CSV table of C-alpha atoms and ligand atoms in Angstrom, one decimal:
chain,number,residue,atom,x,y,z
A,1,UNK,CA,9.1,-6.0,12.4
A,2,UNK,CA,9.5,-2.5,14.0
A,3,UNK,CA,7.8,-0.2,11.5
A,4,UNK,CA,8.1,3.5,12.4
A,5,UNK,CA,5.5,5.3,10.3
A,6,UNK,CA,5.6,8.7,8.8
A,7,UNK,CA,2.3,10.1,7.6
A,8,UNK,CA,2.2,12.6,4.7
A,9,UNK,CA,-1.1,14.3,4.0
A,10,UNK,CA,-1.8,15.4,0.4
A,11,UNK,CA,-4.6,16.1,-2.0
A,12,UNK,CA,-3.9,14.1,-5.1
A,13,UNK,CA,-5.7,16.4,-7.7
A,14,UNK,CA,-2.7,18.4,-8.6
A,15,UNK,CA,-0.4,17.2,-11.4
A,16,UNK,CA,2.6,16.9,-11.7
A,17,UNK,CA,3.0,17.1,-7.8
A,18,UNK,CA,0.4,14.5,-6.8
A,19,UNK,CA,-2.2,13.0,-9.1
A,20,UNK,CA,-3.9,9.7,-10.2
A,21,UNK,CA,-2.3,8.5,-13.5
A,22,UNK,CA,-3.5,6.4,-16.5
A,23,UNK,CA,-3.1,3.3,-14.2
A,24,UNK,CA,-5.1,4.5,-11.1
A,25,UNK,CA,-1.9,5.0,-9.0
A,26,UNK,CA,-1.2,8.2,-6.8
A,27,UNK,CA,2.1,9.4,-8.3
A,28,UNK,CA,4.1,12.7,-8.8
A,29,UNK,CA,7.0,14.9,-7.7
A,30,UNK,CA,5.7,15.3,-4.1
A,31,UNK,CA,5.2,11.5,-3.8
A,32,UNK,CA,8.8,10.7,-4.9
A,33,UNK,CA,10.0,13.5,-2.7
A,34,UNK,CA,8.0,12.0,0.3
A,35,UNK,CA,9.7,8.6,-0.4
A,36,UNK,CA,13.1,10.1,-0.6
A,37,UNK,CA,12.6,12.1,2.7
A,38,UNK,CA,11.2,9.1,4.5
A,39,UNK,CA,14.4,7.1,3.7
A,40,UNK,CA,16.5,9.9,5.2
A,41,UNK,CA,14.3,9.9,8.3
A,42,UNK,CA,14.6,6.1,8.7
A,43,UNK,CA,10.8,5.8,8.5
A,44,UNK,CA,8.1,4.0,6.4
A,45,UNK,CA,6.0,6.5,4.4
A,46,UNK,CA,2.2,6.4,4.5
A,47,UNK,CA,0.3,8.7,2.2
A,48,UNK,CA,-3.1,9.9,3.2
A,49,UNK,CA,-5.6,12.1,1.4
A,50,UNK,CA,-7.6,15.0,2.6
A,51,UNK,CA,-9.4,18.0,1.1
A,52,UNK,CA,-6.7,20.6,0.4
A,53,UNK,CA,-8.4,23.1,2.7
A,54,UNK,CA,-8.2,20.6,5.6
A,55,UNK,CA,-4.5,19.8,5.4
A,56,UNK,CA,-3.4,22.5,7.8
A,57,UNK,CA,-5.9,21.7,10.5
A,58,UNK,CA,-5.1,18.0,10.2
A,59,UNK,CA,-1.4,18.8,10.5
A,60,UNK,CA,-2.0,21.0,13.6
A,61,UNK,CA,-4.3,18.3,15.1
A,62,UNK,CA,-1.6,15.6,14.5
A,63,UNK,CA,-3.8,13.5,12.2
A,64,UNK,CA,-0.8,13.6,9.8
A,65,UNK,CA,2.9,14.3,10.4
A,66,UNK,CA,3.7,16.5,7.3
A,67,UNK,CA,2.1,18.1,4.3
A,68,UNK,CA,3.4,17.6,0.8
A,69,UNK,CA,0.7,19.0,-1.5
A,70,UNK,CA,2.4,21.6,-3.8
A,71,UNK,CA,1.5,24.1,-1.0
A,72,UNK,CA,2.6,27.7,-1.6
A,73,UNK,CA,4.5,29.5,1.2
A,74,UNK,CA,2.4,32.5,2.1
A,75,UNK,CA,2.5,34.8,5.1
A,76,UNK,CA,-0.9,33.7,6.3
A,77,UNK,CA,0.0,30.0,6.3
A,78,UNK,CA,3.4,30.6,7.9
A,79,UNK,CA,1.5,32.0,11.0
A,80,UNK,CA,-0.2,28.6,11.4
A,81,UNK,CA,2.5,26.0,10.5
A,82,UNK,CA,6.1,25.6,9.5
A,83,UNK,CA,6.7,25.4,5.8
A,84,UNK,CA,10.1,24.2,4.7
A,85,UNK,CA,10.8,25.3,1.0
A,86,UNK,CA,11.8,22.6,-1.5
A,87,UNK,CA,10.7,23.8,-4.9
A,88,UNK,CA,10.1,26.9,-6.9
A,89,UNK,CA,10.5,30.7,-6.6
A,90,UNK,CA,8.4,33.7,-5.9
A,91,UNK,CA,5.1,33.7,-7.9
A,92,UNK,CA,4.1,37.2,-9.2
A,93,UNK,CA,1.6,36.1,-11.9
A,94,UNK,CA,-1.2,33.6,-12.8
A,95,UNK,CA,-1.9,32.0,-16.1
A,96,UNK,CA,-5.4,32.4,-17.7
A,97,UNK,CA,-6.3,29.5,-19.9
A,98,UNK,CA,-8.7,29.7,-22.9
A,99,UNK,CA,-9.5,28.0,-26.2
A,100,UNK,CA,-7.6,29.5,-29.1
A,101,UNK,CA,-11.0,29.7,-30.8
A,102,UNK,CA,-12.3,32.0,-28.0
A,103,UNK,CA,-13.7,35.1,-29.6
A,104,UNK,CA,-14.0,37.4,-26.6
A,105,UNK,CA,-10.6,38.7,-25.5
A,106,UNK,CA,-9.3,36.8,-22.4
A,107,UNK,CA,-8.9,39.9,-20.2
A,108,UNK,CA,-10.5,41.4,-18.4
A,109,UNK,CA,-11.8,38.5,-16.3
A,110,UNK,CA,-14.9,40.4,-15.3
A,111,UNK,CA,-16.3,40.0,-18.8
A,112,UNK,CA,-16.8,36.2,-18.8
A,113,UNK,CA,-19.8,34.2,-17.6
A,114,UNK,CA,-17.4,32.3,-15.3
A,115,UNK,CA,-13.7,31.7,-14.4
A,116,UNK,CA,-12.9,28.1,-13.4
A,117,UNK,CA,-10.3,27.6,-10.7
A,118,UNK,CA,-9.2,24.9,-8.2
A,119,UNK,CA,-10.8,25.1,-4.7
A,120,UNK,CA,-8.9,26.1,-1.5
A,121,UNK,CA,-6.0,27.6,-3.4
A,122,UNK,CA,-4.4,31.0,-3.2
A,123,UNK,CA,-5.4,31.6,-6.8
A,124,UNK,CA,-9.1,31.0,-5.9
A,125,UNK,CA,-8.8,33.5,-3.0
A,126,UNK,CA,-7.2,36.1,-5.3
A,127,UNK,CA,-10.1,35.7,-7.8
A,128,UNK,CA,-12.8,35.9,-5.2
A,129,UNK,CA,-11.3,39.1,-3.8
A,130,UNK,CA,-11.7,40.9,-7.2
A,131,UNK,CA,-15.1,42.5,-7.9
A,132,UNK,CA,-17.0,41.3,-10.9
A,133,UNK,CA,-15.3,37.9,-11.2
A,134,UNK,CA,-17.8,35.0,-11.2
A,135,UNK,CA,-15.7,32.1,-9.9
A,136,UNK,CA,-16.5,28.4,-10.4
A,137,UNK,CA,-14.3,26.2,-8.0
A,138,UNK,CA,-13.4,22.6,-8.7
A,139,UNK,CA,-11.7,19.8,-6.9
A,140,UNK,CA,-9.0,19.1,-9.4
A,141,UNK,CA,-6.8,20.7,-12.1
A,142,UNK,CA,-8.1,18.2,-14.7
A,143,UNK,CA,-11.7,19.2,-13.9
A,144,UNK,CA,-10.7,22.9,-14.3
A,145,UNK,CA,-9.2,22.3,-17.7
A,146,UNK,CA,-12.0,20.0,-18.9
A,147,UNK,CA,-14.4,22.8,-18.1
A,148,UNK,CA,-12.7,25.1,-20.6
A,149,UNK,CA,-12.0,22.4,-23.2
A,150,UNK,CA,-15.7,21.6,-23.5
A,151,UNK,CA,-17.0,25.1,-23.6
A,152,UNK,CA,-18.7,25.3,-20.1
A,153,UNK,CA,-16.4,28.1,-18.8
A,154,UNK,CA,-14.7,30.3,-21.4
A,155,UNK,CA,-11.5,30.7,-19.2
A,156,UNK,CA,-9.7,29.1,-16.2
A,157,UNK,CA,-6.9,30.2,-13.9
A,158,UNK,CA,-3.9,28.1,-13.1
A,159,UNK,CA,-0.6,28.8,-11.5
A,160,UNK,CA,2.3,29.3,-14.0
A,161,UNK,CA,4.2,26.2,-12.9
A,162,UNK,CA,1.2,23.8,-13.3
A,163,UNK,CA,0.0,25.6,-16.4
A,164,UNK,CA,3.3,25.1,-18.2
A,165,UNK,CA,3.3,21.3,-17.6
A,166,UNK,CA,-0.3,20.5,-18.1
A,167,UNK,CA,-0.9,22.6,-21.2
A,168,UNK,CA,1.7,20.6,-23.1
A,169,UNK,CA,-1.1,18.1,-23.3
A,170,UNK,CA,-3.8,20.5,-24.5
A,171,UNK,CA,-2.5,22.3,-27.7
A,172,UNK,CA,-5.8,23.9,-28.5
A,173,UNK,CA,-5.6,26.0,-25.3
A,174,UNK,CA,-3.6,29.1,-24.9
A,175,UNK,CA,-2.1,30.9,-21.8
A,176,UNK,CA,-2.3,34.5,-21.0
A,177,UNK,CA,-0.4,36.2,-18.1
A,178,UNK,CA,-2.2,38.0,-15.3
A,179,UNK,CA,0.1,40.0,-13.0
A,180,UNK,CA,-0.6,39.8,-9.4
A,181,UNK,CA,-0.2,42.9,-7.2
A,182,UNK,CA,2.8,42.6,-4.8
A,183,UNK,CA,0.7,42.1,-1.7
A,184,UNK,CA,-0.6,38.8,-3.4
A,185,UNK,CA,2.8,37.5,-4.2
A,186,UNK,CA,3.6,34.0,-2.7
A,187,UNK,CA,6.8,32.0,-2.5
A,188,UNK,CA,7.6,28.4,-3.6
A,189,UNK,CA,6.3,25.1,-2.3
A,190,UNK,CA,6.8,24.2,1.3
A,191,UNK,CA,6.6,20.9,3.2
A,192,UNK,CA,4.3,21.6,6.1
A,193,UNK,CA,5.3,20.6,9.7
A,194,UNK,CA,3.5,21.5,13.0
A,195,UNK,CA,5.1,24.8,14.1
A,196,UNK,CA,5.6,23.9,17.7
A,197,UNK,CA,8.1,21.1,16.9
A,198,UNK,CA,11.3,23.0,16.5
A,199,UNK,CA,13.1,19.5,16.5
A,200,UNK,CA,11.2,17.6,13.8
A,201,UNK,CA,11.5,20.8,11.6
A,202,UNK,CA,15.3,20.6,11.9
A,203,UNK,CA,15.5,17.0,10.9
A,204,UNK,CA,13.3,17.4,7.8
A,205,UNK,CA,15.2,20.6,7.0
A,206,UNK,CA,18.4,18.5,7.1
A,207,UNK,CA,16.8,15.8,5.0
A,208,UNK,CA,15.8,18.3,2.2
A,209,UNK,CA,19.3,19.9,2.2
A,210,UNK,CA,21.0,16.5,2.0
A,211,UNK,CA,18.8,15.4,-1.0
A,212,UNK,CA,19.7,18.7,-2.7
A,213,UNK,CA,23.4,18.2,-1.9
A,214,UNK,CA,23.0,14.8,-3.6
A,215,UNK,CA,21.2,16.1,-6.7
A,216,UNK,CA,18.2,14.0,-5.9
A,217,UNK,CA,15.6,16.8,-5.9
A,218,UNK,CA,17.0,18.2,-9.2
A,219,UNK,CA,16.7,14.8,-10.8
A,220,UNK,CA,13.0,14.6,-9.6
A,221,UNK,CA,12.3,18.0,-11.0
A,222,UNK,CA,13.5,16.9,-14.4
A,223,UNK,CA,11.6,13.6,-14.1
A,224,UNK,CA,8.3,15.5,-13.5
A,225,UNK,CA,9.0,18.3,-16.0
A,226,UNK,CA,9.3,20.9,-13.3
A,227,UNK,CA,13.0,22.1,-13.8
A,228,UNK,CA,12.3,25.8,-14.5
A,229,UNK,CA,15.0,28.3,-15.0
A,230,UNK,CA,12.2,30.0,-17.2
A,231,UNK,CA,11.3,31.9,-14.1
B,301,LIG,N1,-2.6,19.3,-3.9
B,301,LIG,C1,-3.2,20.5,-4.1
B,301,LIG,N2,-4.5,20.4,-4.3
B,301,LIG,N3,-2.6,21.6,-4.2
B,301,LIG,C2,-3.1,22.9,-4.5
B,301,LIG,C3,-2.0,24.0,-4.4
B,301,LIG,C4,-2.4,25.3,-5.0
B,301,LIG,C5,-1.5,26.4,-4.6
B,301,LIG,N4,-0.1,26.2,-4.9
B,301,LIG,C6,-1.7,26.8,-3.1
B,301,LIG,O1,-0.8,26.6,-2.3
B,301,LIG,O2,-2.7,27.3,-2.7
C-alpha cells in the first residue's frame, strides 16, 4: 500500500495518559487520543518512546512528528515548541503523598529524609528550586509510589490529576495539598508540534476541535477516569 506515517513521541511511564498495563501493552488516554487524531489526519500512527526530557529536542530535530506525553503547557516550553491544549486546566497545587501511618507531619517537605518525584517534570523542577528539599527522582509514577509504599521515602509528590486517579488503587496512602506560588502555575496538557510549522499546527488544531465537537475526547476522559470538574 501507500502508508503515510505519523510519529508520536511519548514516555510511557505516566498513567492514565500512557503506561504499560497488566498485559504488557502501551495504553492510555494519550494513546487513544493519538489514534483518534491520526484518523482525522488520514495517517497511520506510530508510537515511539523517549526519555521525557528528550521529547522536545526530538520534536525539534524531526525525529518525531508530535508529542503526546501528558505534557504541561508552560511558558518556558512554549518558547521552544507549539503546544496545542487538549486536556485539563490551570494547575495551582501539587499533591504530597504519604502513608496514613506516617508519624511525622507531611509538611514541611524540608523535614523528610527524601521526597520522591518523577524525573524531567515541572514538579521535580519546583522541588529542586526549594532550599532544604532532598529530592529523589524516578523514571515512572509507579516507581515513585512504590518508594513510599515500602517505606524508602516518607513522601512523594504527584500532580493533582495523576494523584487522583492512581491513589484510588493505594488506599493506605493519603494526599495533602501543597500550593504553588503563581509564578510556578502551569496550564493543561498540550500536544507538541514543531513551532515553525504554522501549517501542521492548524491541521492538528482542527483535528482536536473536531473530536471535541464530536464528544470523542470527553468519552476518552471518562474511559480513563480523567473527567474532572473537581477542579
Ligand atoms: N509521559 C510523562 N512522563 N509525562 C510527565 C509529565 C509531567 C508533567 N505534566 C510535566 O509536563 O512536566
